[PDB]
Design a protein around this nucleic acid. Structure first.
Ligand SMILES: Nc1ncnc2c1ncn2[C@H]1C[C@H](O)[C@@H](COP(=O)(O)NP(=O)(O)OP(=O)(O)O)O1
Ligand SMILES: [Mn+2]
Ligand SMILES: [Mn+2]
Ligand code: NI
Length: 422
DNA sequence: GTGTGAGT
DNA sequence: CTCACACT
């Protein structure tokens, strides 16, 4: 149960090349063809953020210029993100995301984790399904696209063989058997994904396991329109060669410290250290967390749908682009406040609350820190012009140039945020 | 109130 | 870019 961290059934659903599929739903002509989506069109045709699987076979990857990508995929077609106030506009994608989320919310409550993925806690649905099943076996036909991680031992054929070996050894009578709960959870996810495709046409992948970390890791294991079930017994093999920085929450300084201090590279190697050793090197909390996590145990619950605590937006101006004149800072503050007003207005329309505070943050050229300073003021009226003047008033004192004709030092970031909701 | 980390 | 939270 809880001792072995097998108390819940959690799943993660992530859309395959989400932006590409959204383009395919609205503009048919790009469908079933190698394509990509670029961001900025003049420098080099734009950075690539979403690539179709057909094009991935040719070696094309994201974070590389469109013209440089045409090198190995001459058939490659390009689609562009609309631009607004100098930054990307994702309304189309966010609305499609909402569509999918609403369809998923029918089977169970979800936790939106990004623009194209969300976690689902199926524990209750699994109980209901185990009752309604009434002891009938689970045939492989109920899982047409499910992969069992770690099997077979000793491509569609491999999937079916692993599924047969998994199903033939499952407990039938012990209704609290972790493996049985996962199998039923995968059945429910098969239904959920079938419904999602039927009503929207989108394809996706999913991961099924006992916690968020394993569900996420499992989702990307068998990438396009496939789902992976990760049992507690399969964790050791899966972790044997799993990069530490690939585990949710260990991708930053903590993970790097673990690698550096213990001289290891893969998650599976942490199993050899004692809990006291992990606590003596990383602290009580991180030590216990690592000790349980390397054994497949994690407890963050899938928290329910929530109202945002803040609404904000920002923009970066690197190098040459650094804001030097007063006109520039005034104009960009105004642009930000107009986007803010648009969002605050929709927010107030949908949730009957008004933000009472405006937080202003900036970054000065030459400073390594994320923000040079942050200040706040009352946000009484949802008027972009007023907010722009208030933000300017708090940031104007910073200007060190007694000339008053320019900004010295320049600003490399502007951030506006509404909070203290009611 | 700052720092960290996930996800784009 | 956008956001949340743990710290403290
Ligand atoms: N750095 C970035 N900046 C802006 N948009 C981005 C971005 N990175 C990703 N996007 C957008 C591009 C993507 O369309 C969207 C989903 O991100 P994923 O789920 O991580 N990748 P995908 O869904 O494409 O495919 P797959 O399921 O095989 O992983 O995020
Ligand atoms: Mn995706
Ligand atoms: Mn994703
Ligand atoms: Ni004015």
């Amino acid at each position: 149960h809880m001792a072995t961290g097998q108390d819940r059934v959690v799943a993660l659903v992530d859309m395959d090349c989400f932006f590409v599929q959204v383009e395919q739903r609205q503009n048919p002509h790009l469908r079933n063809k190698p394509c990509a989506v670029v961001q900025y069109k003049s420098w080099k045709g734009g950075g690539i953020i979403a690539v179709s699987y057909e094009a991935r076979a040719f070696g094309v990857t994201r974070s590389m210029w469109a013209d440089d990508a045409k090198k190995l995929c001459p058939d490659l077609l390009l689609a562009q993100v609309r631009e607004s106030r100098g930054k990307a506009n994702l309304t189309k994608y966010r609305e499609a995301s909402v569509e999918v989320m609403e369809i998923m919310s029918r089977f169970a409550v979800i936790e939106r984790a990004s623009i194209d993925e969300a976690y689902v806690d199926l524990t209750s649905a699994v109980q209901e399904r185990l009752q309604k099943l009434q002891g009938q076996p689970i045939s492989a036909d109920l899982l047409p696209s499910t992969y069992i991680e770690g099997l077979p031992q000793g491509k569609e054929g491999m999937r079916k063989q692993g599924l047969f070996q998994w199903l033939d050894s499952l407990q039938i009578d012990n209704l609290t058997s972790p493996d049985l709960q996962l199998t039923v959870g995968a059945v429910i996810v098969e239904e959920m994904r079938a419904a999602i495709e039927r009503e929207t046409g989108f394809q996706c992948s999913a991961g099924i396991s006992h916690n968020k970390v394993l569900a996420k890791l499992a989702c990307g294991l068998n990438k396009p329109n496939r789902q992976t079930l990760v049992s507690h017994g399969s964790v050791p093999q899966l972790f044997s060669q799993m990069p530490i920085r690939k585990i949710r929450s260990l991708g930053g300084k903590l993970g790097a410290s673990v690698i550096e201090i213990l001289g290891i590279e893969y998650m599976g190697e942490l199993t050899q250290f004692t809990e006291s050793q992990l606590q003596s090197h990383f602290g009580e909390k991180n030590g216990s967390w690592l000790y349980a996590m390397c054994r497949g145990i994690e407890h963050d619950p899938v928290k329910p749908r929530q109202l945002p605590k803040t609404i904000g937006c920002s923009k970066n101006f690197p190098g040459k682009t650094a804001l030097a004149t007063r006109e520039q800072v005034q104009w960009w503050l105004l642009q930000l406040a107009q986007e803010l007003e648009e969002r605050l207005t929709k927010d107030r329309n949908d949730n009957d609350r008004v933000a009472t505070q405006l937080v202003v943050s900036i970054r000065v050229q030459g400073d390594k820190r994320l923000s040079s300073l942050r200040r706040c003021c009352a946000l009484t009226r949802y008027d972009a012009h007023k907010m722009s003047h208030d933000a300017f008033t708090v940031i104007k004192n910073c200007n060190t140039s007694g000339i008053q004709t320019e900004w010295s030092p320049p600003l490399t970031m502007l951030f506006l945020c509404a909070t203290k909701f009611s």
